[PDB]
Amino acid sequence: YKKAGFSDKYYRSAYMNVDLNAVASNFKVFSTLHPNKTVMAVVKANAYGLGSVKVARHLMENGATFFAVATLDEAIELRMHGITAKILVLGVLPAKDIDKAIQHRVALTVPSKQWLKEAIKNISGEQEKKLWLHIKLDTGMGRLGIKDTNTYQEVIEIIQQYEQLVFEGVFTHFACADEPGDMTTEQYQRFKDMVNEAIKPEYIHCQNSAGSLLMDCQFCNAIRPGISLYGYYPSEYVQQKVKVHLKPSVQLIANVVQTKTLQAGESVSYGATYTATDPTTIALLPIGYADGYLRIMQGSFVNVNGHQCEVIGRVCMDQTIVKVPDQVKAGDSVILIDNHRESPQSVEVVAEKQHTINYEVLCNLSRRLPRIYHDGDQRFVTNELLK
Amino acid sequence: AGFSDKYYRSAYMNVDLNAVASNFKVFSTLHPNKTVMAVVKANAYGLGSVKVARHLMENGATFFAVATLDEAIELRMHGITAKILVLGVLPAKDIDKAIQHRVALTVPSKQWLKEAIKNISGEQEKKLWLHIKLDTGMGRLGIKDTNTYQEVIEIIQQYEQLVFEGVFTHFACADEPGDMTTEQYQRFKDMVNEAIKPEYIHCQNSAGSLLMDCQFCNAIRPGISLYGYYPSEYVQQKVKVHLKPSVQLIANVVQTKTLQAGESVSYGATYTATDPTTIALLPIGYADGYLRIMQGSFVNVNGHQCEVIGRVCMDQTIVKVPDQVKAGDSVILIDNHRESPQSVEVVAEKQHTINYEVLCNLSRRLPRIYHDGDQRFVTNELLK
Ligand SMILES: *Cc1c(COP(=O)(O)O)cnc(C#C)c1O
Ligand SMILES: *Cc1c(COP(=O)(O)O)cnc(C#C)c1O
Ligand SMILES: [Cl-]
Numbered sequence: 001y002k003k004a005g006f007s008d009k010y011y012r013s014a015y016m017n018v019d020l021n022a023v024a025s026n027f028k029v030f031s032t033l034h035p036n037k038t039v040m041a042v043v044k045a046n047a048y049g050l051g052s053v054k055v056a057r058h059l060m061e062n063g064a065t066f067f068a069v070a071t072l073d074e075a076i077e078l079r080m081h082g083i084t085a086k087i088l089v090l091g092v093l094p095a096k097d098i099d100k101a102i103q104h105r106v107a108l109t110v111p112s113k114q115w116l117k118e119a120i121k122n123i124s125g126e127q128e129k130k131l132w133l134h135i136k137l138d139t140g141m142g143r144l145g146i147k148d149t150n151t152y153q154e155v156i157e158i159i160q161q162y163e164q165l166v167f168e169g170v171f172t173h174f175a176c177a178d179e180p181g182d183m184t185t186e187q188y189q190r191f192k193d194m195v196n197e198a199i200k201p202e203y204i205h206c207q208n209s210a211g212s213l214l215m216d217c218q219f220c221n222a223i224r225p226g227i228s229l230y231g232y233y234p235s236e237y238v239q240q241k242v243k244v245h246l247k248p249s250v251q252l253i254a255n256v257v258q259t260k261t262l263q264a265g266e267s268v269s270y271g272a273t274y275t276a277t278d279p280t281t282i283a284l285l286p287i288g289y290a291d292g293y294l295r296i297m298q299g300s301f302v303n304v305n306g307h308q309c310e311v312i313g314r315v316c317m318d319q320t321i322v323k324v325p326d327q328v329k330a331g332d333s334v335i336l337i338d339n340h341r342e343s344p345q346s347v348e349v350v351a352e353k354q355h356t357i358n359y360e361v362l363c364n365l366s367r368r369l370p371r372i373y374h375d376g377d378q379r380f381v382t383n384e385l386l387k
Numbered sequence: 388a389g390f391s392d393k394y395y396r397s398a399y400m401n402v403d404l405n406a407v408a409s410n411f412k413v414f415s416t417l418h419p420n421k422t423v424m425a426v427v428k429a430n431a432y433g434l435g436s437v438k439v440a441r442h443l444m445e446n447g448a449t450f451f452a453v454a455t456l457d458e459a460i461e462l463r464m465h466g467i468t469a470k471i472l473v474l475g476v477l478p479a480k481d482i483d484k485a486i487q488h489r490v491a492l493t494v495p496s497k498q499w500l501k502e503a504i505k506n507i508s509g510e511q512e513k514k515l516w517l518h519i520k521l522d523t524g525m526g527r528l529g530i531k532d533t534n535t536y537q538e539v540i541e542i543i544q545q546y547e548q549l550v551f552e553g554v555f556t557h558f559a560c561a562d563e564p565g566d567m568t569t570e571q572y573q574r575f576k577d578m579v580n581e582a583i584k585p586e587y588i589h590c591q592n593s594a595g596s597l598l599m600d601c602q603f604c605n606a607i608r609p610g611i612s613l614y615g616y617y618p619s620e621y622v623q624q625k626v627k628v629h630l631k632p633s634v635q636l637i638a639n640v641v642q643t644k645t646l647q648a649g650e651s652v653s654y655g656a657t658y659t660a661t662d663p664t665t666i667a668l669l670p671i672g673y674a675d676g677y678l679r680i681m682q683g684s685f686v687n688v689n690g691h692q693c694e695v696i697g698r699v700c701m702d703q704t705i706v707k708v709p710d711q712v713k714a715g716d717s718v719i720l721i722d723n724h725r726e727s728p729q730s731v732e733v734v735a736e737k738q739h740t741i742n743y744e745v746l747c748n749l750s751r752r753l754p755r756i757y758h759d760g761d762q763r764f765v766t767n768e769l770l771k
C-alpha cells in the first residue's frame with residue numbers, strides 16, 4: 001500500500017464536503033467589486049481548513065496571481081505542489097532561514113528595522129535571486145509593523161543600497177473593520193500619510209474581507225480577502241450592511257453506524273451525563289472532538305434526514321451520540337455543519353455554541369477528517385493520514 | 388522527497404519519547420501478566436501516532452488500538468508490524484482492506500457481522516481477526532445481551548476465515564467514585580462466562596488500569612496516561628504511581644513593542660495599556676490549537692509569568708512582558724510538569740474542557756520535535 005496519485009481513499013463515514021465552485025464564485029465577487037486591484041487571496045491556516053494546495057490551484061485556474069500565507073512552511077508547501085503565483089508570508093520569518101525564502105521565490109514581511117538588518121547578515125550569497133519585500137506598517141493595530149515615518153524611510157533606504165533586495169510592497173491591517181466606528185477610517189488615513197512620505201512600491205494593500213466589502217480604498221491597488229473567499233461574512237454587522245451574496249463552501253457530514261433503544265434509567269457516554277426517562281432511540285456517529293466537533297457541542301442540534309436532533313451525553317474523542325426518531329437507522333447521513341447561512345447547522349450557529357467566531361470553527365477541523373472536493377461533476381479526496 | 392524534518396517558524400511541540408516509554412513501562416509493571424494494548428488513536432492524542440507506536444515497539448509493545456482503519460493503515464504504511472485493533476465501526480464495503488492489511492476489527496452488532504460477511508469478495512484470503520464489543524452500561528457501541536453475543540461467536544465458528552480473537556467492554560465512570568465501574572465489570576464477566584473464551588479479554592482504560600487489577604482480563608488499553616496525564620484529578624489523588632508528562636508547547640518572541648497610555652492591541656481594541664507597558668508578539672494562534680479563550684491566561688517568558696492580552700488571532704498571540712524581554716526569547720505555553728501554571732490541566736480549566744481535548748486541538752501546523760536521549764527528530768506535516 002502506497003500514496004494515491006489522484007484521490008486518497010478513506011475508511012470512516014465522516015468527512016468535509018468542500019465546494020470549489022463556491023470558492024471560485026466568491027473570488028469572482030471580489031474581483032468584480034475591485035476590477036482594478038490584484039486580489040491577493042489569503043490561504044493561510046490551510047485555507048482556513050479547506051486545503052491550501054487544492055484551493056490555490058483552483059483559484060489559479062480562475063485567474064488568481066498572488067496568494068498570502070502566515071508562514072514560510074505554508075508558502076513552501078504551495079511551491080512543492082506546483083503553485084507558481086507570487087506568495088507573501090504575512091508573519092515574521094526567522095532571520096537564519098532567509099536563504100530558503102530567496103531560493104523558493106517567496107516574498108517576506110518586514111516588521112521592523114532590526115529584523116531587516118538581521119536578515120541581511122544571514123544572506124550567504126549561495127541564493128543569488130531577488131528577495132521581494134513588503135513592509136508592514138502599524139497604523140494603530142498594535143501588532144506587527146513599523147509605526148513611525150522616519151523608520152519607514154530608513155528601511156527603504158537600506159533596501160535601496162542592495163540590488164538583491166526589492167521594495168515590492170507596503171501594507172497595513174485593520175483591527176475593527178467588521179464593527180462600526182471610526183478606527184478603520186483613521187487607520188486608512190494614517191496609512192496614506194506614511195506611504196506619501198516615500199517612494200511608492202508596486203503593491204499597496206490594506207483591506208481584509210471586511211474592508212474589501214465596505215470600502216473602495218482607491219489608494220490601494222491590491223486586496224487581501226480571507227474568510228469571505230470561503231463564503232462567510234466576517235461579522236453579523238458586515239452581513240447586514242452589504243448587498244453581496246457569499247456562497248458557503250463547507251459541509252460537515254457523518255453517517256449513523258449503530259442505533260440503540262435506551263430504557264428508563266440507562267445512561268449514555270462518559271460520566272452517565274444523560275439518563276433516559278422514557279424509551280428513547282439514540283444514534284452513534286463516528287465523529288468526536290479529535291475531529292474538531294468539540295465537547296461543548298453537547299446540547300446542540302444536527303440534521304438527520306431532515307429531522308432536528310439533539311446531541312446528548314458527552315461528546316467523546318471519536319464518537320457523538322444523537323437522540324433520534326425510531327425510523328432512523330444505520331447508514332443515514334447527518335449534516336453537522338451545513339452550506340447555508342440561514343440554518344440551525346450554520347457555521348455561525350456552531351460558533352455561538354462554541355462561544356467563538358466562525359474563523360475558529362473552521363480552523364478546529366482536524367487532519368483526521370477527509371476533505372472531499374467538488375468541482376462540477378468531479379470529486380476528489382484528501383485524507384492526510386494516508387499521505 | 389519531502390522537507391518534513393525542517394521547519395520555518397519558531398513555534399513547536401517538544402515530545403519526550405523517553406517519558407512515553409517510561410509510562411508504558413509503569414503499566415506493564417503494574418500488570419506483569421497482561422498484554423499492554425497501547426491506545427494511539429487520534430494521532431496518539433496529538434503527539435504523532437507513527438513516531439510513538441514505532442518508539443513503543445522498540446520498547447516491547449506488541450499490540451496497539453486505534454479509532455479508525457485509516458489510523459491502522461497509516462501505522463502499517465510506516466512500518467508498524469504489531470497487532471492493531473480498530474475500536475470504531477468499519478464500513479462493511481471496506482472489509483477487504485482490513486483483511487489485506489492484517490488489522491483486527493470490532494464487532495458492534497450481529498447485523499454488522501452479516502453485512503461484513505456479504506462484502507468479503509474472496510480476493511483477500513487471509514484470516515479476519517475479530518474482537519467483539521460488549522456494551523455493559525456505557526450505552527455507546529456494542530452488544531448488550533448474552534444470547535446475541537453467543538450467536539455472533541457461533542456465526543464466526545462456521546467460517547474458517549473468521550477468527551474470534553478477543554472480547555471487550557469500556558467503562559463510563561472509571562475516573563469518578565461510585566459503584567458503576569464494579570457493576571460493569573461484573574456484567575462483563577457474566578456475559579463472557581456464558582461462552583467459549585477468546586485469546587484476548589480486555590476492559591480497562593487508563594483509569595481502570597491504575598485503580599483495579601481485574602484478574603479476569605489478560606490485556607489493558609491505556610491511552611492518555613501513556614503520555615503522562617492522569618484521566619481525572621480523582622485518579623491522581625487515589626494512586627501512588629508517578630506519570631511523566633510528555634508535551635511542551637513553545638514559541639519564540641518575534642517582535643516587542645512599547646505601548647503608550649491610550650494605545651491598544653489586536654482585534655476589536657479589547658486592550659489599552661494606560662502606562663508605559665511592553666508587549667511581545669508570539670507566532671502562534673488559534674489555527675495552531677491555542678484557542679481564543681486562552682486570552683487572560685498566563686505563560687512563562689524566561690521564568691517570568693506574563694498575561695496573554697488582547698484577542699488571540701489565527702496566527703498570533705500578544706503577551707504583556709517586562710522591559711528586558713526581547714525578540715528571540717522562548718516562551719513556554721504548555722509545560723511538561725503537572726504542578727505548573729502552564730500545565731495541561733490548567734490550560735484545560737481555561738478552555739472549560741478536559742486535558743484530552745487540549746492535546747487533540749494541537750493542529751497539523753505545529754511541528755513535533757521528538758527527544759530520545761540526546762537524539763532529535765522532526766515532523767512538520769506541511770512539508771510531506
Ligand atoms: C488573516 C489576515 C487577512 C484576512 O482576513 P479575513 O478576510 O479572513 O478577515 C488579511 N490580512 C492579514 C494580514 C497581515 C491577515 O493576517
Ligand atoms: C479512548 C479509549 C481508550 C483509552 O482511554 P484513556 O486511557 O485515554 O482514558 C480505551 N478503550 C476505548 C475503547 C473502546 C477507547 O475508545
Ligand atoms: Cl478597483
Ligand SMILES: [Cl-]
Pocket residue numbers: 417418419420421
Ligand atoms: Cl497482571
Ligand code: NA
Pocket residue numbers: 159160161162163164165166167
Ligand atoms: Na533595491
Ligand code: NA
Pocket residue numbers: 248249250251337338339340346347
Ligand atoms: Na458551511
Ligand code: NA
Pocket residue numbers: 267268269270271272273524525526559
Ligand atoms: Na454511561
Ligand code: NA
Pocket residue numbers: 543544545546547548549550551
Ligand atoms: Na472460525
